[PDB]
Amino acid sequence: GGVQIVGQDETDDRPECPYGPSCYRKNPQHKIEYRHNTLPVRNVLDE
Ligand SMILES: Nc1ncnc2c1ncn2[C@@H]1O[C@H](CO)[C@@H](O)[C@H]1O[C@H]1O[C@H](CO)[C@@H](O)[C@H]1O
Numbered sequence: 624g625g626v627q628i629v630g631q632d633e634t635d636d637r638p639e640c641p642y643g644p645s646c647y648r649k650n651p652q653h654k655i656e657y658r659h660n661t662l663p664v665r666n667v668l669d670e
């Protein structure tokens with residue numbers, strides 16, 4: 624199985640959709656031009 628958030632959807636070069644979690648639009652370029660979740664997935668320790 625696997626129900627974790629290790630990547631979400633390849634969002635390393637995305638700015639930030641203004642709608643956010645309540646985004647009712649689903650276009651092909653809208654999921655690649657902006658991102659809906661700004662969670663940390665790379666810098667959480669720095670060693
Ligand atoms: N909750 C919510 N999410 C996304 N977009 C939303 C929205 N509430 C309203 N909008 C957009 O604003 C205008 C109002 O003038 C609506 O027509 C919505 O426009 C959406 O439609 C397109 C994609 O289907 C986009 O232009 C998006 O803005």
Ligand SMILES: [Zn+2]
Binds near residue numbers: 640657
């Ligand atoms: Zn959006």
